[PDB]
Design an enzyme around this catalytic site. Structure first.
Site, mmCIF file in Angstrom:
data_model
loop_
_atom_site.group_PDB
_atom_site.id
_atom_site.type_symbol
_atom_site.label_atom_id
_atom_site.label_comp_id
_atom_site.label_asym_id
_atom_site.label_seq_id
_atom_site.Cartn_x
_atom_site.Cartn_y
_atom_site.Cartn_z
ATOM 1 N N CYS B 10 -10.159 -45.503 88.866
ATOM 2 C CA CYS B 10 -8.621 -45.883 87.760
ATOM 3 C C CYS B 10 -8.211 -47.280 88.481
ATOM 4 O O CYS B 10 -8.275 -47.136 89.766
ATOM 5 C CB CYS B 10 -8.315 -44.477 87.777
ATOM 6 S SG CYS B 10 -7.325 -44.574 86.416
ATOM 7 N N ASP B 12 -5.328 -46.474 88.533
ATOM 8 C CA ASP B 12 -3.851 -46.365 89.240
ATOM 9 C C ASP B 12 -4.024 -46.460 90.668
ATOM 10 O O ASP B 12 -4.595 -46.106 91.612
ATOM 11 C CB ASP B 12 -3.549 -44.417 88.643
ATOM 12 C CG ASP B 12 -3.697 -44.332 86.950
ATOM 13 O OD1 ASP B 12 -2.286 -44.760 86.446
ATOM 14 O OD2 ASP B 12 -3.812 -42.989 86.994
ATOM 15 N N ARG B 14 -2.684 -45.091 92.767
ATOM 16 C CA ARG B 14 -2.484 -44.223 94.752
ATOM 17 C C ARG B 14 -3.792 -44.026 95.309
ATOM 18 O O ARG B 14 -4.094 -43.222 96.151
ATOM 19 C CB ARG B 14 -1.557 -42.886 93.879
ATOM 20 C CG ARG B 14 -0.437 -42.853 94.003
ATOM 21 C CD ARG B 14 -0.171 -41.350 93.002
ATOM 22 N NE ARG B 14 -0.880 -41.283 91.429
ATOM 23 C CZ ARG B 14 -1.051 -41.061 90.081
ATOM 24 N NH1 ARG B 14 0.026 -39.775 90.791
ATOM 25 N NH2 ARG B 14 -1.686 -41.643 89.573
ATOM 26 N N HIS B 66 -9.575 -38.902 89.286
ATOM 27 C CA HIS B 66 -8.387 -38.392 90.280
ATOM 28 C C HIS B 66 -7.811 -37.422 88.998
ATOM 29 O O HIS B 66 -7.193 -38.034 87.739
ATOM 30 C CB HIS B 66 -7.347 -39.229 90.705
ATOM 31 C CG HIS B 66 -6.902 -40.855 89.819
ATOM 32 N ND1 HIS B 66 -5.612 -39.923 89.818
ATOM 33 C CD2 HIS B 66 -7.239 -40.812 88.954
ATOM 34 C CE1 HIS B 66 -5.461 -41.026 89.140
ATOM 35 N NE2 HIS B 66 -6.096 -41.903 88.330
ATOM 36 N N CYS B 69 -3.728 -38.362 86.166
ATOM 37 C CA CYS B 69 -4.449 -39.160 85.947
ATOM 38 C C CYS B 69 -3.615 -39.867 84.482
ATOM 39 O O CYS B 69 -3.505 -39.573 83.273
ATOM 40 C CB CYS B 69 -5.915 -39.412 85.661
ATOM 41 S SG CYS B 69 -6.422 -41.393 84.697
#
Ligand SMILES: [Zn+2]
Ligand SMILES: [Zn+2]
Ligand SMILES: [Zn+2]
Ligand SMILES: [Zn+2]
Lengths: 215, 185, 185, 215
Positions: B10, B12, B14, B66, B69
């Site tokens: 992803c 995203d 982190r 993860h 998300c």
């Protein structure tokens, strides 16, 4: 090959080293973290934005694709851009190109690779659109030039998306950057396309191409 | 080049594959998109897969979702965010597909489950691409994996979806869905 | 089935291939989209092309634009209509690519020219698809055409873009661009 | 084969027959004509909307693709829909499926056809999602069922596009229809999914699938 059991152990080890060295590291990170940057870069392996940027972890939303493209009609990347811009309110987008890029090299070769051919035709259109500048250059200097041009073209495409144009129109802060990374020399300092508006895009882009068309 | 893994994750913030897997530099060939999707008709992701398999002869493709998300949360929410919703419709299909199992669930556990299911569905899709199949067909070594990185503790979790052939894809895909739909913890 | 032509035209409402070509029923295998585009990475149009060429062995692909095309007008206008603008960017690229020639033009003639140029560019794209090339490569009979239907008089106009091989594609594509850029009437 | 010189002459002849039989036919048509319908149908050759609808010429905006799909993330068809709905203000969209469809048949076969495989995987997902209903049917009755299901699924997808949902939300008039055509029997009268709203979509769709799941 059993690279997988090794990969897991390395994750484990890394996660332990981070906790023991900062107990609340994952707590802090897992929560309410809003990125302020989007990175559009190449899938190639020695061009990770984690490596190349010095940003705090959680600051970078990331997309990567073959040859760092923003194709006008690509649903995938346009979705990343629109989510980043309209929903997450990110205020800087970075397109990062690099030298010795497989995509660029494959765009330039005539191997039938199936699907990836369709994708690289976009690059080949960019090669042909600067045929003059590239043709009057030395065969093995050309990949490097095409990479540099490509970044400028993709930023141009980015800035012409309905998404970016609207953001700018309704006065949202949004700046686009196009940089080029070299494995040895690092980031080529003469590159930086940079735009905060459609008027600035045009100038920055045009100038960038002119600058590149110097002998 | 010669990286050894394609990592499909992803976008995203982190969840950096490099940081997290802690590998040698240059091991990872990477695609990231919103909610780590493999969509049958997405030239973007597919081109990465093909470059990985046919040009670099990568032998391992990892799809890693993860916890926590945003993509998955947006996919779960009935709320118009614009263009992105059409992208998330594929996941929202999955939500409704396993709506009975997710219906049973305590509402703060549903995002975690949909994250898991989503990984298994995306691997099922990877495994059905002409790209992956031809490589199997003609004897190339190629394994697909489906994991979930937990942002609360830094830990990769196997979802037990693993395929080395079309037949083993079926087997473990079905198993994982059954396992998640039937069993409890 | 056995239709003999794939017709790739615009979705615009006055321009029905069936009506206009006045052929036997069932001759036309058809794709229509906004501004009759062939985009290197568009599964939709490409799937039609592939079905046509590899499954039905169609020997003729026609790309037909038309006068008075809303798509082309939107492509020319600097005005945000939404999602559709990204689709029309490909044509707007073409507008700016031949901006010197179109610049010369009397403003009410520019839409007609961009219509013409657009057809030639789209054929150039069709001709560069792996689908078309492999069919040529392996000896299948396959010709590509680029015409413009004039909505003011019902008449198909050849644009003189015609290709039966990669080499003849180059030749006539270049010719057409040169012809349009240089000559005057 | 010289089917082309024949095609042109037939155009010519047709255009002449239309003028001589109605002098201002093309004038009337060429101008200011606003369609009120959009037709999404199959590229297959005996399913032309010109043939199947009785609409005035210029009333129909048209898209056609393999197996009449509305794939959530397809830029091509989504653009037709968004232009039709947001710009042309069309108030009816028709998805038309048909029996003996090559796409359906190819979705159901295991031939590697390259690119078209990727596109048909969407249909195969629909086949698997109704595996029960189809499996307990007779092998050669199944294509016909899958076609019918497919229309219902594509209309469902249409009604869930950001584009259609918004139109409805801001109270624009917009109705979706899903019909199925047979070369002999004609339009199968028991088909019609029909929606003017998200609530109606749901009912119409659900009912349509239930109706189809009858023994
Ligand atoms: Zn690269
Ligand atoms: Zn995510
Ligand atoms: Zn048009
Ligand atoms: Zn069909």
């Amino acid at each position: 090959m059993d690279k997988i059991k090794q990969l897991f152990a390395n994750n484990y080890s890394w996660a332990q080293r981070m906790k023991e060295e900062n107990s609340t590291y994952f707590k802090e990170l897992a929560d309410h973290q809003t990125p302020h940057y989007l990175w559009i870069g190449c899938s190639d392996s020695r061009v990770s934005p984690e490596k190349l940027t010095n940003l705090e972890p959680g600051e970078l939303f990331v997309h990567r694709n073959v040859a760092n493209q923003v194709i006008h009609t690509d649903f995938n990347c346009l979705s990343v851009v629109q989510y980043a811009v309209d929903v997450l309110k990110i205020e800087h987008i970075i397109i990062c190109g690099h030298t010795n890029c497989g995509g660029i090299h494959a765009a330039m070769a005539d191997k039938d690779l199936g699907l990836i051919n369709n994708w690289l035709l976009h690059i080949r259109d960019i090669w042909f659109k600067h045929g003059h500048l590239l043709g009057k250059l030395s065969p093995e200097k050309r990949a490097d030039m095409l990479t540099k041009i490509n970044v400028a073209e993709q930023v141009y495409n980015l800035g012409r998306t309905s998404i970016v144009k609207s953001a700018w129109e309704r006065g949202q802060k949004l700046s686009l950057h196009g940089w080029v990374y070299d494995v040895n020399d690092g980031f080529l300092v003469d590159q930086g396309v940079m735009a905060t508006s459609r008027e600035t895009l045009e100038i920055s882009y045009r100038n960038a191409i002119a600058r590149l068309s110097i002998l």
